[PDB]
């Protein structure tokens, strides 16, 4: 509710609007989706690679992030990219058919698109439930962009050098979220909302750990790793 806190919220909202296209116009640039085992890999690999760029673009605008060292910025983005991707995907996720609907039937993704290969259901079943539970929080867009930023600036990520500064930046955002809920999220929706949002960050860590397991299996098959992008291999590697 402070002038500084409103400043943070305005920056994070504009940063999100600059890095998330609700028209999904750029999806034409991706390799084409095909729906028959790994038929969707080239299209979805380009989707993830595109989204990593947008997550980095959002991360740059977070107040205090640029004040970090270059190496802490890389550690934070490497460990959080897939978590922010899962978070930011909730905007396109719909509970009608439990799918990410990005504007066209070709750009609608369900469990069968992603969970037919290997053990990928061990990630997709918990991921859909996370999407369902996150949607049922009905967050304000202000709260959506704060949670993404809090997720990125995490002091406990492995390999963080300066950790006190990461904590100071995250607490600035965390105190902005808690004060926002009290001041503009009315009851009953705001009941326990901050604690439920923090719990979603814990769900993301287990989804992150499961994603790491499936990527390692996917990447060890060179024929499948050929289908990825250079940025995905660099970040998820």
């Amino acid at each position: 509710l402070s002038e500084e806190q409103q400043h943070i919220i305005a920056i994070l909202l504009d940063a999100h609007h600059k890095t998330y296209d609700p028209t999904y116009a750029d999806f034409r640039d991706f390799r084409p989706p095909v729906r028959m085992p790994l038929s969707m890999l080239p299209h979805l690999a380009d989707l993830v690679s595109y989204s990593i760029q947008k997550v980095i673009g959002f991360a740059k605008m977070i107040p205090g992030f640029r004040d970090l060292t270059s190496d802490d910025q890389i550690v934070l983005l490497k460990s959080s990219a897939i978590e922010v991707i899962m978070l930011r995907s909730n905007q396109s996720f719909t509970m009608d058919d439990m799918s990410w609907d990005c504007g066209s039937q070709d750009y609608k993704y369900d469990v069968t698109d992603v969970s037919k290969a290997g053990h990928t259901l061990e990630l997709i079943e918990p991921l859909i439930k996370f999407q369902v539970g996150l949607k049922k929080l009905n967050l304000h867009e202000e709260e959506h962009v704060l949670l993404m930023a809090i997720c990125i600036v995490s002091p406990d990520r492995p390999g963080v050098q300066d950790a006190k500064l990461v904590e100071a930046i995250q607490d600035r955002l965390s105190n902005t979220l808690q004060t926002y809920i009290r001041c503009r999220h009315p009851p009953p929706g705001s009941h326990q909302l901050y604690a439920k949002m923090i719990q979603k960050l814990a769900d993301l860590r287990s989804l992150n750990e499961e994603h790491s397991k499936q990527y390692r299996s996917l990447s060890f098959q060179p024929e499948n790793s050929m289908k990825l992008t250079p940025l995905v291999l660099e970040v998820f590697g």
């Binding site: 760029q53 980095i56 673009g57 740059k60 270059s70 910025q73 890389i74 983005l77 490497k78 250079p230 940025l231 660099e234 970040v235």
Partner: peptide
Amino acid sequence: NHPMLMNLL
């Protein structure tokens, strides 16, 4: 050793 990500930064 992360040229593309550091360039995006």
